[PDB]
């Protein structure tokens, strides 16, 4: 979950310091990493 | 793409007010809708 | 000094949100209090 | 008034985020520069 771990850090870290770009890049990364986890076990 | 339009609208509209809680629930629907639409027209 | 305190609080609160009118007026009041600091009995 | 600009610049920026420590240092500059000007016209 290391790939997902880093993504969670950015979104929550951005959440505190009100931001738009940082939140945006993180959120897509999380879902992008989630779909990454969707197929990570298979390959 | 009629559906994707609403996602774009809400995200941009929310982003103006520098509101993050509603942006978060929107910026996800855009990616969810985008993949969903790609999955449509086939089934 | 009490005068600067209220202005500082107001500017900080305004900047915390994303409203510009309050920020501008509070900055004006900040500078006003800063100059008035000498403007009061000190030097008068 | 250039000196007081930076102190005001940091405070609003810190207040924009929630970096408490940055705010704490900055606010002292606001008061510190407040006397500095009144102590600057006299040389």
Chain D neighbours, 3+ Cβ pairs < 8 A:
A, C
Name the structure determination technique.
cryo-EM
CA atoms within 13 A on the CB side of A20: 12
SS3 content of chain C, % helix, strand, coil (to 5): 80, 0, 20
Structural domain boundaries enclosing A25? 1-43
CA D34 to chain centre: 8
Whether A24 contacts B27, CB under 8 Å: yes
What secondary structure letter does DSSP report for C21? Answer: H
Q: Tell me the C-alpha distance between B20 and B15, whole Å.
A: 7
Domain count, chain A: 1
Whether D31 contacts C4, CB under 8 Å: yes
SS3 content of chain B, % helix, strand, coil (to 5): 80, 0, 20
* CB contact (8 A) between residue D16 and residue C15: yes
Question: Mutating which of C14, C16, C18, C19 best tests the B interface, going by the most B Cβ atoms within 10 A?
Answer: C18
Whether C5 contacts D5, CB under 8 Å: no
Beta-carbon contacts of C2 under 8 Å, excluding residues fewer than 6 positions away, are none
């Amino acid at each position: 979950m290391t790939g997902l771990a880093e993504a969670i850090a950015n979104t929550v870290q951005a959440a505190q310091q009100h931001d738009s770009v940082k939140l945006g890049t993180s959120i897509v990364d999380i879902v992008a990493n989630g779909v990454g986890l969707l197929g990570k076990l298979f390959g």
